Design a protein around this ligand. Structure first.
Ligand SMILES: *[C@@H](C)[C@H]1/C(=C/c2[nH]c(/C=C3N=C(/C=C4\NC(=O)C(CC)=C4C)C(C)=C\3CCC(=O)O)c(CCC(=O)O)c2C)NC(=O)[C@@H]1C
Ligand SMILES: *[C@@H](C)[C@H]1/C(=C/c2[nH]c(/C=C3N=C(/C=C4\NC(=O)C(CC)=C4C)C(C)=C\3CCC(=O)O)c(CCC(=O)O)c2C)NC(=O)[C@@H]1C
Ligand SMILES: *[C@@H](C)[C@H]1/C(=C/c2[nH]c(/C=C3N=C(/C=C4\NC(=O)C(CC)=C4C)C(C)=C\3CCC(=O)O)c(CCC(=O)O)c2C)NC(=O)[C@@H]1C
Ligand SMILES: *[C@@H](C)[C@H]1/C(=C/c2[nH]c(/C=C3N=C(/C=C4\NC(=O)C(CC)=C4C)C(C)=C\3CCC(=O)O)c(CCC(=O)O)c2C)NC(=O)[C@@H]1C
Ligand SMILES: *[C@H](C)[C@H]1/C(=C/c2[nH]c(/C=C3N=C(/C=C4\NC(=O)C(CC)=C4C)C(C)=C\3CCC(=O)O)c(CCC(=O)O)c2C)NC(=O)[C@@H]1C
Ligand SMILES: *[C@H](C)[C@H]1/C(=C/c2[nH]c(/C=C3N=C(/C=C4\NC(=O)C(CC)=C4C)C(C)=C\3CCC(=O)O)c(CCC(=O)O)c2C)NC(=O)[C@@H]1C
Ligand SMILES: *[C@H](C)[C@H]1/C(=C/c2[nH]c(/C=C3N=C(/C=C4\NC(=O)C(CC)=C4C)C(C)=C\3CCC(=O)O)c(CCC(=O)O)c2C)NC(=O)[C@@H]1C
Ligand SMILES: *[C@H](C)[C@H]1/C(=C/c2[nH]c(/C=C3N=C(/C=C4\NC(=O)C(CC)=C4C)C(C)=C\3CCC(=O)O)c(CCC(=O)O)c2C)NC(=O)[C@@H]1C
Ligand SMILES: *[C@H](C)[C@H]1/C(=C/c2[nH]c(/C=C3N=C(/C=C4\NC(=O)C(CC)=C4C)C(C)=C\3CCC(=O)O)c(CCC(=O)O)c2C)NC(=O)[C@@H]1C
Ligand SMILES: *[C@H](C)[C@H]1/C(=C/c2[nH]c(/C=C3N=C(/C=C4\NC(=O)C(CC)=C4C)C(C)=C\3CCC(=O)O)c(CCC(=O)O)c2C)NC(=O)[C@@H]1C
Ligand SMILES: *[C@H](C)[C@H]1/C(=C/c2[nH]c(/C=C3N=C(/C=C4\NC(=O)C(CC)=C4C)C(C)=C\3CCC(=O)O)c(CCC(=O)O)c2C)NC(=O)[C@@H]1C
Ligand SMILES: *[C@H](C)[C@H]1/C(=C/c2[nH]c(/C=C3N=C(/C=C4\NC(=O)C(CC)=C4C)C(C)=C\3CCC(=O)O)c(CCC(=O)O)c2C)NC(=O)[C@@H]1C
Lengths: 162, 172, 266, 74, 172, 162, 162, 172, 172
């Protein structure tokens, strides 16, 4: 999992070196960020139910056929809506992990690695989840460094799906 | 490899849960200690060569069989290897201190070290004594109050002692 | 390692091996020596029949048309390598063979297996083989002109300690080869990120005295055990039993439902 | 010569192409501080590369401070 | 590679000289632009896929010879290689922006790239046209006043554009 | 040349990755550090001749034989004293480079790599230079982060010599 | 391209072997198939426009939002409808190449390799193309060996897309 | 590499066209020749050792300078290398016959062989002569009317001769 | 590589003839000189560090620009490399002396060396000067009459001087 602290050691270790000022600076950079990330995680967590519900609704509005067409990959029944809300919940939850971890590591490990195969195997449009992530970006109400770091992870996912 | 933040994250994902309020606040507390952590890492690193050579000298003085002809740290090649190992362990201890998690030390350095030393005939008990010596010197260096903003480093000092203990336990 | 340990572990010849480099303006003998060394290393020391030699690739190397690294890759991609190590082996055995043959080490962690299983599933055999030879690890240890050699018995930058212990599972002695497929001895310890005791050379030996029965032989049974009788104190156990008691011991272990991981003479 | 072996087994039109890289200036850097083998030539060295490995060799050379002075179709 | 700081160091060491007060002050002025530099890097990265695809769509619309049967970007494999190259070039431009020096772009991306395209028959001039469309999209992204602390980024924007120009010239 | 910025790009490049929040945090940690390093660089430069002259004399005091014994490797004549002051000047100047760069890179590139071969070839004792570097640690009058970063580089050099 | 004859030689060449009976049997297998493949190619070619037009309309019928939604990736305007017909024409034309060549070689080389990246980048749903390919399977009117070989290539593409 | 079929495909794809009725019928005509093509490959392959060995003896008889001391075919390694080269060329001619396209022979065997022989000092003209002798014996073997369903193999024999001529012309 | 013997054999074989009686006699004279050749190799080898370090010291004193900041032998890595090259050249000179043929020196040391230095910006003329100083000290060491059976070594000294001159010319 990529985070500033694990990347610092991995690099130092691959070089067979003690940590130096360069890695200490990496740690300071982590500290400057960490509290804002933790607050971002808390703010997203508290609002998660509303964020997840609004995102699924946003996807259904942008892609009405998903709630009208029969098929295992669509949300025309409650089964599909539950799957969809669950998936969006996964994205949001793992994004909170990235804010806690201070890096995309959690997205890389838990969500992004393999998502292309899943979306093709089960015929899920990546554009659906892009729209959900857009919604969360607009409605999470963060500001400052919390908004910037949270948006970086949301954009990282959007870019991986795009 | 995990650090203090990702160790908690990984457990949360396995449970399918957001981090609770208290878990985030515990992480906030870890952030509050970050400067002390960096200072500890910086201090052990800065004294690395002395910590190893002093701990090495003391070990061989207490255990002259290691450096006697036929001993396991006798001949230049084996002495060099032995000194290298002490530095290796110290280096991975500082890594664990820096990350706040033992994974780097355990996965990469300690796992298989006992089997390695048994296979080679390196006396693990002797290695453990050397690690203990590096432990005490490092903590004294970390705990030195001169030339640093005063504060309480007891928690970090305990953590660092823990990593040294893992290494001592591992090699025997 | 040094004589005192290498002698016990049966790796003296590995320690005294000298990397072989193909120099500018090499003689015909030096090219011949290099071709022999590549075949020994990449094919895991099988007896090589003349019908199996890569006539063309040998010519190109001798003509300085291709580098040593190109020739290693030609052999690794050949049908000979495939038939020996791929078509009759499970994937994880195939992967550790590639690590031994091409990088001269044992796999460090389960994620290496996962990476290479994914790569084979994605790009097939050629992409899998090229990953080893094109890797940073290959280029920095051997470059384009040095024949690969076993490295697992020496402390490498950015290795895991368990690489040393695991080396003894994939390197079984000088007079051995990867010829019979089979399963990996590393599966469980890779999957669970653990290590196993090194029983190689003469380190398997244990004292007999008067306790080793009529044949004066002890067998070392390594088991994984649980409490399904007397209390079990360790999930991993070893038993030393004489030949005469070996059947009884197996039956005891079997009756308890415990798993035998390895048995060897002691 | 060399194409017969350099081009792999893909049996693709795209992969059935070899290019001769001329590289110069390969020298000691922090990128190859740990390298276990010696650099023998810093002048023009020529490297045959199949199309399928052009990304890798270009990255390897560039990561090693080498200059790609020319690339010629085989 | 060099960054903005080490570029100056290398020049000073060649002369065997300490950095002058003017050079230190200039690097201190570089530090003061640091946050804007990070923002520009972050903004380009968060829009990487859109920058590339929009630039690619516009290129192929302008130059339909590239995608018609027989064109250099016809067939999925070549189209994907083309998109990949656009992404690569943008990635290394962000690297140069992040370090504040052109060396990473020149040493690791543009090194031999003109020769690669000639040997392959890739139309280098069309690559340059593509890079230009990515430059124009990227600068507007960096210059967007919405959702960011307001200030003058014209210096960083000018530096970014030069990195795009250097990439474009390297192929054209 | 190890610095936070180059190491950040080196790592991302080896992964074929755009820069992410992890690397941005590395940048912030650099920005938090840079001004103290630049100030440390200035203070050391302005006091350079004093620091170098004193450090040289400290070596002569600690190792008196280096001013009394004949031989190319010693400083018994003006030739050797000049060489010795030059060397100490190299350490100090390059240390200032490290403070400017923000990492050991300049020490690694210009001084550390190959130092053992030089000292063995020309029979120069590392202990002489350790003493010189200790003097500089004891007399540069830095405080706070300037002192911390500067001592790390001095200690880095000392450790490389020990 | 991957075809029975080139694969036979490629394998033989890697072993440094003259062609043997095994390869001759491969050639005989190709001959058994060739005429039916050439007949399938002509039949698909002659009805190309009808198949392509029909297939394109089949996609529109099954995915009506493609002709109703504004966007670069959709066929709501003449531009997209022309892109779509072109694309479906590509699938059809390359499939005829496979029948001529006797293998998936042409599909692999010209269309399939990289298709995942194209569809992701340009936000094209692979389900659209699967539907077009199914229409062609249902309307090409082949029988016997010609039908079996054609459908194998259509299914090969379908499997690649899902 | 191309075979007779994929040679036409690649050209058609480059133009974005379906194969014409004329092209398909041409390919159908090739199919009709398939049995003769296969027989010719089989016959050459069955006699490969004799074709090479007789061609080499005849070449060294006409050109004794090749096999005198200091000659290019003198010493066992050079003689063996020379015989290998003859067998390689014949092998690739049978590949081309089998595929019905010259690309395998040209891409793998001939392209660059002239330059390689020039650098080695291998007399390219003598190689061409040997290729001629193999061609003459190979064509006689293909034409042997005994033991085979009688028919006109003139077209296949002309193609095979063309492949030998390419090989001969590529060395000298 | 060749040695003094295999050099004659290789020429003889290309002509297909036995070594003449005078060629065998000449090699016998070479054998009569074997002890002096061995002594000279031993003497240079025994003093290799001194030969290298003294010549290097003499070179930098004569050519101060080399070691000024920005000079080619400035920085430890460059100085280290320079010292290594001196030793490499000296080592290969002894190899040539040991074998009695220059082929080892030319093939494994000097081949490509001028191009290497030109590409690196190493001043080849300064290298040649350092080789001259090594040559001078080596020949004095070889001619030192003390502690060795007395005899006339002028022939071997001339042969050695030639190898040094060969090295110096190859770079300058
Ligand atoms: C040109 C690039 C645009 C612009 C930039 C700009 N940014 C700032 C200030 C800040 N930007 C950041 C950035 C981040 N904070 C984070 O936590 C992260 C996520 C990892 C990022 C990328 C920060 C920390 C600051 C400083 C605090 C602040 O908000 O002021 C400025 C102000 C000047 C300064 O350099 O500090 C400017 C000008 N502004 C524009 O108008 C351009 C469109
Ligand atoms: C136990 C570890 C000892 C101890 C530590 C301690 N340190 C601080 C505060 C700081 N330490 C640093 C460290 C650095 N600054 C740099 O620029 C670098 C070089 C890369 C380093 C290593 C910093 C930045 C701070 C904050 C500013 C300050 O100077 O105070 C504290 C104070 C509490 C805090 O959390 O910051 C403490 C306690 N103090 C002791 O007495 C122990 C022996
Ligand atoms: C010119 C090449 C000579 C020639 C050839 C020729 N062959 C046939 C017909 C056949 N040849 C084969 C071949 C094989 N059958 C096998 O099982 C194998 C072994 C693996 C081989 C090589 C076959 C199957 C046929 C068809 C059936 C038959 O027995 O004839 C012909 C007839 C035309 C045709 O296209 O079939 C010809 C002309 N004939 C000559 O006179 C030349 C000397
Ligand atoms: C010019 C080179 C100087 C010189 C040389 C010289 N040497 C000998 C004779 C011998 N030298 C040796 C050498 C060795 N014996 C060993 O055991 C080893 C250690 C591995 C070495 C290097 C030997 C064996 C001999 C033969 C016995 C003897 O001592 O005479 C000669 C004498 C003639 C001869 O060719 O043997 C000479 C001339 N003499 C000088 O004056 C030059 C300074
Ligand atoms: C004597 C010339 C000067 C001197 C010597 C001295 N040496 C040490 C310590 C060590 N010496 C060695 C050397 C070896 N160990 C081996 O195994 C072999 C190879 C067979 C050798 C050559 C080693 C390894 C040590 C360190 C460990 C040990 O104590 O054995 C010391 C003490 C250093 C210390 O810190 O304890 C001394 C004093 N010192 C002088 O001043 C003499 C001029
Ligand atoms: C010193 C306190 C003791 C001692 C040490 C000793 N160790 C070895 C050999 C090895 N040590 C290791 C350990 C590691 N290698 C790694 O890469 C890592 C970090 C990831 C570790 C922890 C290994 C793998 C070896 C074996 C391979 C190698 O030697 O390179 C020796 C040498 C034994 C020999 O016979 O050569 C020695 C001497 N010996 C003592 O007596 C001290 C108690
Ligand atoms: C002959 C008297 C008996 C016999 C022999 C036999 N051996 C093998 C296979 C191998 N033999 C070795 C042995 C060595 N390889 C080495 O490199 C060394 C020296 C360090 C030795 C001693 C090896 C490693 C193999 C396996 C590799 C390979 O076979 O290529 C076989 C072949 C078995 C098989 O084909 O499966 C045979 C037949 N067999 C008898 O019946 C005789 C009693
Ligand atoms: C797109 C706008 C244009 C285009 C591009 C195109 N490029 C290639 C092939 C290659 N491009 C590169 C370049 C790089 N690879 C790297 O790793 C880096 C440095 C990190 C660079 C700059 C390389 C090396 C290749 C060849 C290797 C490979 O593709 O894997 C192609 C394919 C050409 C072919 O014939 O296959 C294409 C299509 N083509 C256009 O028409 C656009 C104008
Ligand atoms: C001073 C503490 C003691 C001392 C110094 C001394 N040094 C030399 C010679 C050299 N010093 C260096 C060192 C460097 N060169 C570099 O480029 C760098 C990195 C930037 C360093 C650190 C080198 C390479 C040499 C040899 C070449 C040269 O002379 O420039 C000498 C003279 C040695 C000789 O044989 O000429 C001396 C005297 N000597 C003392 O006694 C002091 C205590
Ligand atoms: C039709 C089923 C649906 C549809 C199609 C559509 N496609 C594009 C754009 C492209 N199509 C391709 C496909 C290929 N290019 C090739 O070379 C080959 C292999 C021979 C294939 C299969 C590509 C690469 C593109 C992008 C580049 C280009 O435009 O040429 C579009 C336009 C996308 C855009 O952003 O411009 C459309 C509309 N769209 C629908 O809604 C239909 C259901
Ligand atoms: C025989 C009729 C003539 C002859 C041949 C000869 N060739 C060589 C050396 C080489 N031949 C090749 C050619 C190839 N190698 C391959 O793998 C392939 C397929 C891609 C070909 C076409 C090569 C590469 C070499 C050089 C490397 C090697 O020696 O194997 C020699 C040897 C020359 C020498 O050893 O110096 C000879 C003798 N020579 C004649 O006189 C005949 C006219
Ligand atoms: C010293 C007298 C002069 C000098 C030397 C110098 N050389 C290099 C670098 C290299 N030298 C070589 C040469 C060889 N490598 C070999 O393996 C062999 C054959 C066995 C030879 C002759 C090479 C290949 C290099 C480059 C790779 C490497 O350094 O290992 C340097 C460093 C150049 C740089 O920029 O780092 C130097 C300084 N320089 C002088 O100023 C003296 C005149």
């Amino acid at each position: 999992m990529k985070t500033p602290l694990t990347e610092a050691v991995s690099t130092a270790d691959s070089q067979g070196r003690f940590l130096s000022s360069t890695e200490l600076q990496i740690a300071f950079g982590r500290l400057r960020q960490a509290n804002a990330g933790l607050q971002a995680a808390k703010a997203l967590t508290d609002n998660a139910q509303s964020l997840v519900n609004g995102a699924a609704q946003a996807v259904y509005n942008k892609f009405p056929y998903t709630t009208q067409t029969q098929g295992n990959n669509f949300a025309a029944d409650q089964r599909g809506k539950d799957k969809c809300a669950r998936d969006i919940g996964y994205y949001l939850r793992i994004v909170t992990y990235c804010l806690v971890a201070g890096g995309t590591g959690p997205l890389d490990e838990y969500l992004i690695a393999g998502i292309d195969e899943i979306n093709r195997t089960f015929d899920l449009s990546p554009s659906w989840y892009v729209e959900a992530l857009k919604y969360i970006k607009a409605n999470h109400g963060l500001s400052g460094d919390a908004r910037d770091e949270a948006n970086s992870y949301l954009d990282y996912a959007i870019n991986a799906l795009s | 490899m995990f650090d203090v933040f990702t160790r908690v994250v990984s457990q949360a994902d396995a449970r399918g849960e957001y981090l609770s309020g208290s878990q985030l606040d515990a992480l906030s507390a870890t952030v509050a200690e970050g400067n002390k952590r960096i200072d500890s890492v910086n201090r052990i690193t800065g004294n690395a060569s002395a910590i190893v050579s002093n701990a090495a000298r003391a070990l061989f003085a207490e255990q002259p069989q290691l450096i006697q002809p036929g001993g396991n740290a006798y001949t230049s090649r084996r002495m060099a290897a032995c000194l290298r190992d002490m530095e290796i362990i110290l280096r991975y201890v500082t890594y664990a201190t820096f990350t706040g998690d033992a994974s780097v030390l355990e996965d990469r350095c300690l796992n298989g070290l006992r089997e390695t030393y048994v296979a080679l005939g390196v006396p693990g008990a002797s290695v453990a004594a050397g690690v203990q010596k590096m432990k005490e010197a490092a903590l004294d260096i970390v705990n030195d109050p001169n030339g640093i903003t005063r504060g309480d480093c007891s928690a970090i000092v305990a953590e660092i002692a823990g990593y040294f203990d893992r290494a001592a336990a591992a090699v025997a | 390692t040094s004589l005192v340990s290498a002698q016990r572990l049966g790796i003296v010849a590995v320690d005294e091996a000298i990397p072989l480099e193909l120099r500018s303006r090499s003689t015909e003998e030096e090219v011949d020596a290099v071709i022999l060394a590549v075949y020994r290393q990449v094919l895991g020391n099988d007896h090589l029949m003349s019908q199996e030699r890569l006539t063309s690739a040998e010519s190109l190397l001798r003509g300085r048309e291709i580098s040593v690294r190109d020739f290693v890759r030609a052999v690794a991609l050949s049908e000979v390598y495939r038939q020996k190590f791929f078509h009759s082996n499970p994937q994880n055995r195939f992967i550790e063979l590639n690590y031994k043959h091409l990088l001269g080490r044992a796999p460090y962690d389960q994620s290496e297996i996962a990476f290479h299983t994914d790569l084979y599933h994605q790009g097939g055999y050629e992409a899998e083989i090229n990953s080893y030879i094109d890797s940073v690890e290959y280029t920095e240890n051997f470059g384009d002109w040095v024949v690969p050699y076993f490295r697992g018995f020496a402390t490498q930058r950015n290795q895991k300690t368990v690489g040393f212990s695991r080396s003894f599972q994939v390197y079984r002695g000088y007079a051995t080869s990867d010829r019979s497929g089979s399963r990996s001895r590393l599966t469980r310890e890779l999957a669970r990120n653990t290590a196993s005791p090194v029983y190689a050379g003469s380190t398997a030996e244990s004292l007999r005295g008067t306790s080793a029965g009529s044949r004066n032989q002890m067998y070392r049974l390594q088991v994984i055990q649980g409490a399904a009788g007397t209390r079990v104190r360790r999930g991993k156990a070893e038993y030393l039993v004489s030949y005469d008691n070996l059947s009884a011991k197996l039956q005891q272990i079997n009756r308890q439902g415990d798993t035998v991981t390895m048995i060897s003479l002691a | 010569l060399g194409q017969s072996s350099l081009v792999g087994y893909s049996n693709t039109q795209a992969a059935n192409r070899v290019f001769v890289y001329e590289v110069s200036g390969l020298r000691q850097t922090d990128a190859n501080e740990n390298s276990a083998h010696d650099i023998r030539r810093s002048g023009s060295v020529f490297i045959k590369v199949p199309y399928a490995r052009m990304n890798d060799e270009m990255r390897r050379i560039s990561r090693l401070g080498g200059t790609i002075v020319n690339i010629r179709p085989y």
